[PDB]
Every structure is written in C-alpha cells, then in structure tokens.
Amino acid sequence: YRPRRFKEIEHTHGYVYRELNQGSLLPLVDANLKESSSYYFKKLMSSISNV
C-alpha cells in the first residue's frame, strides 16, 4: 500500500501538525469488571444487527 500524492504546491511547501501519542486503554480496562460486565455484554449483543 502507498499514499496518494497531494498537489504540487503542497509537496514543495506543505506542513502538517501531527501527534505521535497512541495512548492506552488500560486505565479503563484495569478495574473490577464483575458488575459492569453484564451491562457491557448487553451493548455488545446489540451492536450486530439481529435477525
């Protein structure tokens, strides 16, 4: 895979602001998920369209 080229002006003088921090899901994950699991499972079942 390769990215598509921009306009010629943007290649010669173009600049872009980017953030390299990817983050982590551990703070949300790291908990006693015993009671919140049932509520999350109900939302999970509803995500996929039901016959």
Partner: protein, 301 residues
Amino acid sequence: ANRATSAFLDNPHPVGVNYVDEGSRQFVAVAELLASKLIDSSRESDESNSDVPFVQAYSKFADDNPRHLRVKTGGKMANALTNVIRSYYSINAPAIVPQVEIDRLASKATVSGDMYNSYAIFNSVPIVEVLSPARTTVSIVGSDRADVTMLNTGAGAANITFNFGQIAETVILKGSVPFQLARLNQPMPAARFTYKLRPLDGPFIVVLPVGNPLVISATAATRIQVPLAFNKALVESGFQTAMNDGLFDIQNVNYYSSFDEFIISQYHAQDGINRVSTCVILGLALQAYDQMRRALPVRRV
C-alpha cells in the same frame, strides 16, 4: 642511566581519519539521542505491559518495526554505527559505510552536532619518563593511580627526575614516608608527605636516601572538550562491550584497559591535539553503542 615509563603511554597507534566531518558528527549525535530513547522506551514497555512504546522507538531507530521470528539488532543504523566505531580506532580498519547512508541517518533528528560545548576530567596519570642513577631500581605500576617504588643501595642521596609531560593540568603526589621534591635549580624544601605540582613547571627532582623503600602515589587530572551529552559511565561501559565483541581486533593496534588511558595516550603523542578530536567522537559513538546494545541483547551465554 636507567629509564622508566608508563605502559599505556608506549607507542600510541594512529586513529582513523574518516567520518570526522560535520555530517558524520551529526550522525553520531543522532545515534546517541535515538539510542537513549530506546532505553527509556524499553523501561516504559516493561512497566506498561505493552509493546507500544518499544515499537515506536525501534521504528524511528531502525526505519523498520520489530519482527517476530527474527532477532532485532537495530537494522541499518546499528550496522553503520558499528562500522564507524571500528574505523575510528585505527587507520588499518576499513571505511565501509557510504556517505549517502550517513546523510540519510543524520536527518532523523535535529541535533546540533557540536563537539566542544562542555568539558570532562580524565584521571589517567601520565609518567612520560623517570630517570634513575646506576644503583637505584624504579618500578611504575598503575594507570588510575601510579605507584612508583624506588630503592637506593649504597652511597647516598640519589636524585630521581620525574617528567610528567605537558598535557596534564594538575598532579598530586603522595608518599609512604615524607620526601623531598623540588624543581630544577631550586632549593629542596623540608620533607613532607604530599605535593601539588603543575606538570608544565618542569622536571621534578626527588631525593631518595638509602634503605627504607619510598613509594610515591600519583593522581592526575586532565580536561578535554566534550559534548554536553557526554557521560563517562556510558562511554567506559561501551568501551568494554566493544572490546568483548571484537570490534577492536585489528592488526598492529594497541589495547587499553579503559577509555581514560586511550584518550590520554593519544593526547600525549605527536599531533595529539587532532587525535583527541577523533577520540571524542569515538566516545560519543561508544555511548550510543552501549545504550543500543543494552536495549537489544543478542549475545546469550
């Protein structure tokens, strides 16, 4: 008649004359900066129980992501850094890395590349020459602390001449028993335990009586211009790793116990001022080699 000299000061081999331009210096400084990021990312990855911090740092360092079923050694950046370290040590070592690779690698970071921002103190004591009379035996042992043991048999008041060179800044002399020491054509002062000397003052004469061997312990301090990122602990550790891996196993070269003896021996040779500039760049490269090699450990006993 008899002459004695320090072991580490004898026959300093020439250093490499390659990879000393501004672009090559920027490459070494980039390697040190990115190797440091590798060490911190490994610590973060260990604490976070994830490979995300290490992958980002390795990808920046090696232009490739870490690969499964394939040892991670550092890619082309590691290959270029290892070969230039070999080239810095001796002229006999070849020049293998092309200029295109260095310019590509030097553009990864935004380092200054200055090699004269700061200073460092080196503790190797240079004893260039100790001249002794016919019935006196003199022995020089040590590099960080030189122990000179002198015995006089017969007659009396043998005169021993000390030549510490001209590069060292200050030299401190300590004796087992108080002794007399003064410069050339100067009166001898009362015997005392310790002396503070400037090596540029001139040759130093020490009076040695009969019997009762007198041992003089000498410590020296020398200042050399080094970058701000210079860290002597990392450089010395990198020096031992390079010696163990065999990067310095070149023909017609001299081997030293530490980077301190290496830089001092090259400084005391002829045209030693221009040798030191190459040695400092070798020190920064060995600093990067140490941090990179600890982050990625290939060798397993």
